[PDB]
Write a protein that binds this ligand. Structure first.
Ligand SMILES: CCCCCCCCCCCCCCCCCC(=O)OC[C@H](COP(=O)([O-])OCC[N+](C)(C)C)OC(=O)CCCCCCCCCCCCCCCCC
Ligand SMILES: CCCCCCCCCCCCCCCCCC(=O)OC[C@H](COP(=O)([O-])OCC[N+](C)(C)C)OC(=O)CCCCCCCCCCCCCCCCC
Ligand code: SF4
Lengths: 98, 105, 150, 115, 70, 69, 318, 175, 80
């Protein structure tokens, strides 16, 4: 295909390996998730802008929009842990094993 | 269970965007409008398996229109040959390619 | 280096930034000096509350035994160059409460004092005179000439 | 290209002032001028303790309202469209959805503060 | 009295006059006496590139008129 | 429009007529060969036109509109 | 020759910041029934020079507990961000002619808070943390109103370009059909730049200095010039938005004179405002902007959506 | 090495992504992703997407200003690590930078790498158009027909954002 | 309904003003007489090229010259 496509998809899988290997913090994983979505948005916008698809130009930003509509939910899924545990370490999140 | 209610109620929800060769605002064509038109009209209603087995040439031409990768290989080959011929030293660029050319208008 | 010394002495002495460190009667006298009658701000003297952005410190009031670490830390957090102006009699030699059990006999024992202003409380015109004397002390500084000689 | 030149010139002028502010004057540091500022006393603990911040929902809904802004922002070019009735009806609909979210926040005690 | 601020603020007026005016004067130098051709869309850029390609000196501000053709 | 089509055809002819004098000793190459199965005209990508010219024209033509303030 | 234009854009606004400090102290004394600084020079003309040299020959005094990366990165980013959004301003011809200069202003204004957050977190103190939290709350308050004010005012302009904003003034000012939005925009510019009664970060009575309480001289002056360039540029932007003047292509002197005088008068009005009112609590900041400002600007936004359709007054996008 | 400006911006994009993918601390990860988003917005502006680049800029600034407020609110440790205060953070950062330079050296040498799909070494400017779109920009009418053509999409987006508001209200109630 | 309106006007006038402006913006474009004028103003803007058509010989409406009286005019916006 090209070169910047390779760079963007490699950034996506780099951020995927960042998310799929935790480092004892939930919000850092949320940041990696938003990075994966950044790579997705950048790839989609570049693909459209190369292919002159005008009417599909709504799809990137709306994609972006919906990501925030879940990302805040992840933040809303953080303080509740902070309302039960003192911190937000994932190794403390092992109550569901019995 | 693909409940296609878009045809049952006759309401257009997302058929106006799903294809690159659709109706566009202010009538702007995409970069592969003709190839999309050929690939749709050749592979309409005959089934996906027969479309893949028979309409492969126009789909290949459309994919070459979109990705342009064979043209990239062509440009890479001629540019590597050009760099090599400059590097040994049996090629001189013309004044038209070098910049002092006085373009058409 | 003589004229460059004349420049940086003019820059420091015309933009003195004191700190809001009052403790007693003498603090109210400082606030009376900062009134429109005497107008410290006309001399390039504008009050700044943080020790990290202050040039001089005017110790107004009585420095007690519960206050010496606070004054020492506040003075130690100020950036160089720093000057200390003692005020009143309480911060000069204890004054009225010199013989008390919980009053530091002059704030010289905690911080090095540059300008002594006598009074109880000193008049705001006398305080302006003391600040002008401090400005004239800054003016005759000889930092770069001494650096060139050394 | 000119935006890049302006950015580089602005960054060069910005980072030249701190370098002038740092390496020109004489430094003299001890272990009290570098101490944290707590009004002349030692700090009680560290500042890395978790703040019991009370407007978490206000920050999240600021994010959500900014995405409402992102939906409402390409409206001027839609003024040049042909189908004006759908434009006006759905711009009013989206503004009404914003107002519905704000009114639900108002009624269900969300704009106030915790504790 | 009060009018004594009127000197100093006037200096700020000069400090709010020197930048923008200079840009206009710069626009009267690099563009050969005319304004800078404001390009906003593809057709304005195409016309400016047409002037650049027809001027023969690779400058768009050198505008040739009806005397150029015979 | 007439100027644009004449210039595009002129640039493509210039690129094709110099492709012959560079690639002769290579084996098994047909000069001017298209990569499309159909003979219909396509709008050429920018690499086919200015892929043999100097780079100053590249940053003055490709990014020239975007980089003009 | 863009370097000369950039230098002549960026240096005299720093000089304007310095003389803004001069006239700030002078006028702020003058409504307080006292004189201003007039000892150092003739009518105090040498006060900004002494202030500038004095801050740059002091000791930087980096704290030990402060993370040095963001501690050294915050003021340069603040000064750059206060400097980098001056370009799309038409003066009468802007430096860079961007079609979407309003979006550029909005995004670089959203970036301007990050210096405050990094200076609050880099220095290890409670006061800096409280200042950073109050700055966060201030951003929560002002952004969701300011975006809608700018959109609803801009709806009659037809496009996001600031160059076409000078065309719309050729008949009447837009402060006449959008005077309520002018009030909303002025309160929003009061809130964004962190000026009293919406300061809430460099507090004197609440905190000591807030986000830069641990910032000694040298790095501290950058925040000062960044804030003053911010307020001067914001008043210039408000002047261009609501009180745009008469532009003649053959003589830019008229428009430069007019917008300079109008922006100077608006900055004097800002100085007049900043020291006549008590400081607001930051809990009442989003008890006002999220409660009183937001429904009113939603109503006015839908009114300005439905108004050009009503009167058949759709503006051109070009 | 001039017309590789898109390549250079993409390399800074991958560098910032490797930098914040180590997950050292939410503030420093936000800084790394913000550098990455800045050069990605630069990519989109260099491809003519003024509106999309500025929109992703403004959205990311708001979203991780909120993230900054949250990590300074709740998710904080006593001694946050910058990049070198812990071993595995620096190890995976250096590892990611080494693989980044690995395919940099792979793509500047043979001009054709094969990672899943095949990839070329020329800049993307070769695929950009030679035609002119008149007195208008096409993406502008995309986001303008967002309101006219885009009926179902805008309806479901607004309903999903309203549902997000009501869900986020319902979650942090406690009782 | 007068007492309730007076009560909300006394407590918070901002909500009353906002709802009045919202109701006006909802019900006035449905009663506007110039909306169709906006429709033809938007429809009459010549963005793309008006390409001609082939001729079979049977067309009474389209002209052969732009200045021919046959075809649509734009007199209504010129007068207004
Ligand atoms: C708006 C623009 C502002 C620009 C910046 C401000 C303008 C003036 C710039 C120069 C100011 C003077 C030099 C820096 C400050 C020095 C302060 C000081 O007292 O230094 C004393 C010091 C000497 O004192 P010292 O070395 O003994 O150290 C004093 C501290 N003790 C004793 C505790 C260790 O001066 C110097 O070190 C000399 C600096 C260079 C002087 C000129 C050299 C020749 C240049 C040609
Ligand atoms: C930009 C150009 C220049 C602008 C003016 C600059 C000079 C003047 C500056 C004055 C000082 C400003 C700073 C100090 C105040 C800061 C606080 C503040 O502003 O609080 C906002 C205050 C806060 O109100 P409050 O403090 O009284 O809150 C009390 C609230 N209750 C009563 C519920 C207890 O006001 C608002 O929030 C209202 C927003 C503006 C209203 C504008 C109305 C315009 C007209 C609408 C229509 C009216 C007709 C009726 C309907 C008709 C329908 C068809
Ligand atoms: S010196 Fe006198 S006026 Fe000053 S604090 Fe002491 S008793 Fe009060």
């Amino acid at each position: 295909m090209s070169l910047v496509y390779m760079n963007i998809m490699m950034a996506f899988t780099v951020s995927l390996t960042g998310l799929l290997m935790y480092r004892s913090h939930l919000m850092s994983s949320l940041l990696c998730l938003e990075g994966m979505m950044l790579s997705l948005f950048i790839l989609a916008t570049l693909m459209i802008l190369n292919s002159h698809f005008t009417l599909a130009s709504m799809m990137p930003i709306i994609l972006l929009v919906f990501a925030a509509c879940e990302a805040a939910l992840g933040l809303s899924l953080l303080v509740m842990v902070s309302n039960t545990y003192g911190t937000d370490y994932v190794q403390n999140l092992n109550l569901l094993q019995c | 269970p693909f409940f296609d209610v878009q045809k049952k109620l006759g309401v257009d929800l997302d058929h106006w965007m799903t294809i690159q060769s659709a109706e566009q605002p202010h009538r702007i064509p995409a970069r592969c409008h003709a190839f999309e038109k050929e690939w749709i009209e050749c592979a309409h209603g005959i089934g996906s398996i027969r479309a893949e087995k028979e309409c492969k040439i126009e789909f290949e031409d459309f994919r070459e229109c979109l990705l342009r990768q064979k043209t990239m290989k062509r440009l890479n080959a001629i540019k590597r040959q050009r760099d090599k011929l400059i590097k040994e030293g049996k090629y001189t660029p013309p004044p038209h390619h070098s910049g002092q050319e006085d373009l058409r208008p | 280096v003589a004229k460059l010394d004349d420049l940086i002495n003019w820059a420091r002495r015309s933009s003195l930034w004191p700190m809001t460190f009052g403790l007693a009667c003498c603090a109210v006298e400082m606030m009376h000096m900062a009134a429109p009658r005497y107008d410290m701000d006309r001399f390039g003297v504008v009050f700044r509350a943080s020790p990290r952005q202050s040039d001089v410190m005017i110790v107004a009031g009585t420095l007690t035994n519960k206050m010496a670490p606070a004054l020492r830390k506040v003075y130690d957090q100020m950036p160089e160059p720093r000057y200390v102006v003692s005020m009143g009699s309480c911060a000069n030699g204890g004054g009225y409460y010199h013989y008390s059990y919980s009053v530091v006999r002059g704030c010289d024992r905690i911080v090095p004092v540059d300008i002594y202003v006598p009074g109880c409380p000193p008049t705001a015109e006398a305080l302006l005179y003391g600040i002008l004397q401090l400005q004239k002390k800054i003016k005759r500084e000889k930092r770069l000439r001494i650096w060139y000689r050394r | 290209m000119n935006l890049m030149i302006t950015l580089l010139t602005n960054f060069t002028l910005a980072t030249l002032l701190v370098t002038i502010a740092f390496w020109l004057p004489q430094l003299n540091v001890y272990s009290e001028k570098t101490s944290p500022y707590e009004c002349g006393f030692d700090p009680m603990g560290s500042a890395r303790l978790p703040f019991s911040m009370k407007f978490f929902l206000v920050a999240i809904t600021f994010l959500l309202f900014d995405l409402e802004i992102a939906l409402l922002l390409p409206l001027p070019w839609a003024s040049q469209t042909t189908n004006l009735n759908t434009m006006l009806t759905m711009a009013l609909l989206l503004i009404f959805l914003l107002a519905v979210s704000l009114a639900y926040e108002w009624t269900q005690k969300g704009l106030e503060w915790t504790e | 009295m009060w009018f004594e601020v009127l000197p100093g603020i006037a200096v700020m007026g000069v400090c709010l006059f020197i930048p923008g005016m200079a840009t206009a004067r710069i626009h009267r130098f690099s563009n050969g006496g005319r304004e800078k051709r404001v390009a906003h869309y593809s057709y304005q850029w195409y016309l400016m590139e047409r002037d650049r390609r027809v001027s023969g000196v690779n400058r768009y501000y050198v505008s040739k008129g009806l005397e150029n053709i015979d | 429009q007439a100027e644009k089509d004449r210039r595009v055809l002129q640039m493509l002819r210039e690129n094709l007529e110099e492709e012959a004098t560079i690639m002769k000793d290579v084996p098994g190459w047909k000069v001017g060969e298209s990569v499309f199965h159909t003979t219909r005209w396509v709008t050429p990508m920018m690499g086919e036109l200015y892929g043999l010219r100097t780079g100053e024209e590249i940053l003055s033509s490709t990014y020239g509109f975007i980089w003009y303030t | 020759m863009f370097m000369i234009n950039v230098l002549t854009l960026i240096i005299p606004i720093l000089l304007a910041v310095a003389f803004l400090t001069l006239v700030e102290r002078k006028v702020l004394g003058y409504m307080q029934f006292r004189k201003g600084p007039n000892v150092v020079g003739p009518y105090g003309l040498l006060q900004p020079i002494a202030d500038a040299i004095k801050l740059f020959i002091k000791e930087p005094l980096r704290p030990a507990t402060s993370s040095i990366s963001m501690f050294i990165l915050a003021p340069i980013l603040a000064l750059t961000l206060a400097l980098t959004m001056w370009i799309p301003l038409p003066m009468p011809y802007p430096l860079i002619n961007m079609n979407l200069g309003v979006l550029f202003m909005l995004a670089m204004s959203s970036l301007a808070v990050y210096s405050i957050l990094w200076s609050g977190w880099a220095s290890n103190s409670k006061y800096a943390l409280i200042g950073a939290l109050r700055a966060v709350a201030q951003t929560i308050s002002y952004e969701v109103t300011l975006a809608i004010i700018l959109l609803s005012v801009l709806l009659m302009n037809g496009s996001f370009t600031l160059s076409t904003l000078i065309i719309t003034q050729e008949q009447v000012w837009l402060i006449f059909p959008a005077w309520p939005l002018a009030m909303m925009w002025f309160i929003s510019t009061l809130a964004e730049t962190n000026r009293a009664p919406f300061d809430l970060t460099e507090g004197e009575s609440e905190l000591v200095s807030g986000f830069n309480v641990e910032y000694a001289a040298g790095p501290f002056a950058l925040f000062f010039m960044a804030e003053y360039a911010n307020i001067i540029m914001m008043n210039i932007f408000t002047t261009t938005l609501f009180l745009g003047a008469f532009h003649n292509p053959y003589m830019p002197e008229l428009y430069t004179i007019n917008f300079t005088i109008k922006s100077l008068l608006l900055s004097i009005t800002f100085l007049w405002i900043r020291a006549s009112y008590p400081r607001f609590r930051y809990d009442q900041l989003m008890h006002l902007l999220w409660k009183n400002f937001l429904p009113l600007t939603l109503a006015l936004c839908m009114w300005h959506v439905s108004l050009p359709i009503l009167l058949s007054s759709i503006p051109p996008q070009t | 090495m001039m017309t590789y400006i898109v390549f250079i911006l993409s390399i800074i994009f991958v560098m910032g992504f490797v930098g914040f993918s180590s997950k050292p601390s939410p503030i420093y990860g936000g800084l790394g992703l913000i550098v990455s988003g800045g050069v990605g917005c630069g990519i989109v502006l260099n491809f003519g997407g003024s509106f999309l680049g500025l929109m992703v800029f403004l959205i990311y600034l708001g979203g991780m200003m909120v993230v900054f407020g949250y990590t300074t609110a709740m998710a904080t440790e006593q001694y946050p690590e910058v990049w070198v205060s812990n071993k595995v953070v620096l190890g995976t950062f250096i590892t990611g930078l080494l693989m980044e330079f690995l395919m940099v050296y792979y793509v500047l040498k043979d001009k054709e790498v094969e990672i899943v799909f095949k990839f070329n070494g020329m800049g993307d400017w070769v695929i950009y158009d030679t035609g002119d779109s008149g007195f208008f920009s096409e993406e502008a009418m995309g986001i303008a027909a967002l309101y006219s053509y885009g009926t179902w999409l805008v309806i479901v987006t607004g309903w999903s954002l309203l549902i997000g508001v009501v869900v986020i209200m319902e979650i942090t109630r406690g009782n | 309904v007068a007492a309730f309106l007076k009560n909300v006007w006394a407590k918070e006038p901002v909500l009353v003003a906002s709802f009045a402006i919202a109701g006006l913006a909802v019900i006035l474009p449905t009663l506007s007489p110039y909306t169709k004028y906006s429709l033809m103003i938007n429809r009459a803007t010549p963005y793309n090229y008006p390409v001609p058509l082939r001729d079979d010989g049977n067309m009474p409406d389209v002209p052969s010259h732009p200045q021919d009286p046959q075809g649509p005019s734009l007199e209504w916006l010129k007068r207004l």
